[PDB]
Amino acid sequence: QYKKIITSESVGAGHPDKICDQISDAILDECLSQDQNSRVACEVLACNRLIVIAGEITTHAYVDVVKTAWEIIKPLGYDENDFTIISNVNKQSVDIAQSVDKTNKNLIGAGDQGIVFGYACDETPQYMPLTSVLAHELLKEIERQRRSKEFIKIQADMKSQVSIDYSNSTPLIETMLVSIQHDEDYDVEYFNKKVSAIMEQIAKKYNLNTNFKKIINSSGRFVIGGPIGDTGLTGRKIIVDTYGGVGHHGGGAFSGKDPTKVDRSASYFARWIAKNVVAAKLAKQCEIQLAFAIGQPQPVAMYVNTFNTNLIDETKIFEAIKKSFNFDIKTFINDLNLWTTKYLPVATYGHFGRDDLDLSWEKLNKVEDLIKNSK
Amino acid sequence: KKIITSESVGAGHPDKICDQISDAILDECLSQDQNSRVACEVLACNRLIVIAGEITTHAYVDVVKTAWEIIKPLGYDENDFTIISNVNKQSVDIAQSVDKTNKNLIGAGDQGIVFGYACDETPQYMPLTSVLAHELLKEIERQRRSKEFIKIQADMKSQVSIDYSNSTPLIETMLVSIQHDEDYDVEYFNKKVSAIMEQIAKKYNLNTNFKKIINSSGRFVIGGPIGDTGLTGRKIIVDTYGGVGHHGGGAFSGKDPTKVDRSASYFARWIAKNVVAAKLAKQCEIQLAFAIGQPQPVAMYVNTFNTNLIDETKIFEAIKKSFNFDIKTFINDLNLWTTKYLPVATYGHFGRDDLDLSWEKLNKVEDLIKNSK
Amino acid sequence: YKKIITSESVGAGHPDKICDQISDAILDECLSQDQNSRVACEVLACNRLIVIAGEITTHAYVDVVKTAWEIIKPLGYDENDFTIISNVNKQSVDIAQSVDKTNKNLIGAGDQGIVFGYACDETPQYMPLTSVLAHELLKEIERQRRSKEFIKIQADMKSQVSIDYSNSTPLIETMLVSIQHDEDYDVEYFNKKVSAIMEQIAKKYNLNTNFKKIINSSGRFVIGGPIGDTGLTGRKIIVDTYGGVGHHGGGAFSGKDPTKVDRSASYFARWIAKNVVAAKLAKQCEIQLAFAIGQPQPVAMYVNTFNTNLIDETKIFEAIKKSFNFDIKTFINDLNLWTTKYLPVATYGHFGRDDLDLSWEKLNKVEDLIKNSKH
């Protein structure tokens, strides 16, 4: 059919790529709790019966990577004998470190080159694309019910996908799709009814229609799951972690990385700018691209896109942003308290628009400055 | 000439690194849970350490931290090895055989044969060859750590040959190989080793004119797991009697006392040592054989190598009357659930007058003398 | 008061023996491609991991995965049962310069150490009866497992044979076997098969058939192989040699090229001892040889005939010195060790193998020993 049907996904806490992101970030959190000058780039692979914990860490901390891994996998139903754990923790290259640690100048140089995008829109109270919001809410509710035993005979590996029709000014849900790992002895009629009710409850929470197509466990059988069914790796859900394919992406993964890795810290910074632009009613949608060079303390380029939804001249938005924000890396890392933020909570259900958390980059504390500086 | 030879290896020898990590892990399990079942095996090669085996316990052991405790005093750091942790549980089929329904019994954790040995050559009741080989390396490693012997590393081996042709033993050869720094001074090194060798000979009142073989390869800069792969249980002759005693093939390190390879070997040593200390024989070797799940040995043989000072049958009888052969009972008699095993993972499990081991105590001499009437 | 001596064996599916077989299969492949290979291959097999490690310098290429599958497939495993880790380091150049003398007609010993060779006149193999019987039991069971004459068993197994030497005719005191069996086995059939095999082996050696039989004493052995117990190369050195009747110097054989004197000098010492006994110079003979790394001959030797010498001990010692060449390169060549296949000795012992044709088992030095013992 000829329609503007846009679709986003989410994955659950027992999805194998997400297991890896959680182990990465739990390891990071333990390092930063002990040593706020740590350099951490922790990458995890989970396949069949092997978890590999790798990457580059220089720190005065000590993290028990096995115990950390068990903290992620035990609430999903795994035990201490399910995986071989390989710890292959190298140090940070001293050639990278000397570029980042500009001790001479009181600066932080970017930890790599790269491009990041921040995005926000006015479709939801979270300032996020509705497709992404709904996809995450479905899986958060299913996992909440799995743990409380309100939804029985399911497991933690799951995925969702939500399609919205934006052909006219009011969004309508077109399709909600979920796949949930289930026990062998499940009752498919009970399962279908539980999923259908969750789907309707999420639609009603956002005041949307309830007569959309429902695709429920389309494979027809999902008993094998987690890393047994599919290999996970850190940073393989970067679109689920961000804006569901509505926002552009520069390719950088977040989990496992300390704030000197601009892939993470500048992504958060760009979100904070974009969200405040939209909350200030300067635009309905805003995307901020920032580019970096390794060792340089400021971005090498910036572009601001308001998708023709700017309410004032784009040059005044651009100017207001430059006057309201500090683009020095060390400074924005400190402005967002990134050394003392806990990252494990954002390793599932997305890093942005988390009205269930209290993230620095989600604060609307720049609206007044943007309004004043746009005049 | 009658020339007998034994060896030892140092704390940085790669097989011994593995034995030490195995026993360190075991000691941590038993400190938390005295009913742990542990069979921890370790491999160290180039830049990989693999920690494996079968553990069922209430304890939690940080295997990485434990491994670092062994390798850091040898000069390694946290980025030298990838560590693989592959801890499986104990087979429930083995467990039901060991943990009897009758809760007063422990079944043997496997079949097997063990040998215990003792002789009257040293105050340790050990072969002189083995005693000297270990003492050389203990002194070198002591000096490495105190910095009295500089520009050496922890991987080392020794080998001592004794001439037993006459009634006084004579040292024939002492051999040492010690990993050394690239910028070492070979003259200083040779002089230090020569003096250590003489100091050990003098400590045992022996001759000091023996052949000395010092770093025969001519260069030993590459060492530890980089130079040679280590595995747990690959130094079982060094761990025991230096080739003078027989061996049944079972390794010690990493095993809880329900593994009779370990606990019955200790028990057999305790018997043999007390037999010799009681002056029933000059040398005594005790063989015990086991069957998995059975609480007592299925066979025993006592060999005194024609050095018995009383009838062999009376020794055999005195042993049967003086010791309890029930596994659970001898484990408890030797306090094996609360003994620390790390200290015996280097420099041998027997004749350690530097330690205080239950199986080395001469507390059965009076019983053996009384029961040999 | 009975004199009861006991020795053991293990089967081809015993996890330590799996490791010895993979080690020697890798060695055999290296030597088939490059007769100057230096090989020290060590293997670990746990739960679901096989690690192939050690030090190899060669022009050969060995597919270690394919080689491991060649050992494990006839035992019932498949390509998805194990993760395989290949960690092949090169031989230390510091060892190599000591072994490979500039004088190209010499080989220096690959290490220090002590080895023992042993032989006795109890069996046609010139081996302890206890060891011979223990191996024969498991060879026959494994033969029947493969031909399907003995059903519902698996390849992990052990034996232990106790002989009563109190009288001039040996008596079997106990035969013990443990065999991994299927869940749905019939214990009555299983006990009858094992009992018959035990009797058949006794009758083959003209021994009594009324001995104690200990058959699967654990009462259940369904879990086995590396799942039930961790294997490592070189952890059955007494099973590989003389069953605890002969002394041992601690060196393992499997995975090692002939420049490793732990292997080649052990074979040489066996060859000497066996020929001494076959020449009727003694009923039992044990030869100890000691080495120093880089030196082309032994640094010590001791000959023990256990008071069974039929001529003066000094003449035995002299006859040995006159009949054998103790230069390492020379005895390696005399035993054709560069072209012998080692896989066949990785199960059921390296000595007294009347089922194989090994150079170190040949009685081709009897004539020299007799001649050189007279004057």
Ligand SMILES: C[S@@+](CC[C@H](N)C(=O)[O-])C[C@H]1O[C@@H](n2cnc3c(N)ncnc32)[C@H](O)[C@@H]1O
């Ligand atoms: C264990 S950390 C801290 C040790 C000591 N506390 C200090 O301040 O030096 C030292 C180095 O270990 C390496 N490493 C290996 N495994 C590690 C882990 N599990 N936790 C932290 N560092 C690890 C990192 O490269 C790190 O820089």
Ligand SMILES: C[S@@+](CC[C@H](N)C(=O)[O-])C[C@H]1O[C@@H](n2cnc3c(N)ncnc32)[C@H](O)[C@@H]1O
């Ligand atoms: C379908 S798998 C990916 C392809 C897979 N690696 C293969 O070898 O074909 C990706 C994700 O889908 C989910 N999945 C796994 N098995 C599934 C099934 N049987 N039905 C539905 N979804 C499943 C899990 O979340 C898994 O991470």
Ligand SMILES: C[S@@+](CC[C@H](N)C(=O)[O-])C[C@H]1O[C@@H](n2cnc3c(N)ncnc32)[C@H](O)[C@@H]1O
């Ligand atoms: C961690 S332990 C103890 C858990 C808990 N305290 C209890 O009593 O149940 C549980 C199982 O973890 C397995 N395991 C895996 N890695 C381990 C490790 N590093 N330390 C101890 N047990 C380990 C052993 O199989 C053990 O029986």
Ligand SMILES: C[S@@+](CC[C@H](N)C(=O)[O-])C[C@H]1O[C@@H](n2cnc3c(N)ncnc32)[C@H](O)[C@@H]1O
């Ligand atoms: C000689 S190496 C063993 C053979 C070795 N795996 C190979 O690839 O030839 C065994 C031991 O001797 C010692 N070693 C290593 N390099 C040596 C050298 N260059 N000189 C003398 N001894 C050495 C170490 O203690 C090591 O564990």
Ligand SMILES: C[S@@+](CC[C@H](N)C(=O)[O-])C[C@H]1O[C@@H](n2cnc3c(N)ncnc32)[C@H](O)[C@@H]1O
């Ligand atoms: C692959 S081999 C031979 C390559 C080439 N044919 C030649 O003669 O140089 C070269 C080195 O690779 C290493 N290597 C790593 N894995 C190996 C393997 N699987 N088989 C053989 N050598 C291996 C050994 O250290 C060996 O000395």
Ligand SMILES: C[S@@+](CC[C@H](N)C(=O)[O-])C[C@H]1O[C@@H](n2cnc3c(N)ncnc32)[C@H](O)[C@@H]1O
């Ligand atoms: C008993 S296991 C060794 C100790 C063991 N690793 C543990 O965790 O207790 C040693 C060998 O005995 C045999 N074995 C394994 N399970 C057995 C069973 N249930 N009954 C009898 N023998 C078994 C296998 O050959 C295995 O290699």
Ligand SMILES: [Cl-]
């Ligand atoms: Cl996926």
Ligand SMILES: [Cl-]
């Ligand atoms: Cl060695």
Ligand SMILES: [Cl-]
């Ligand atoms: Cl075993």
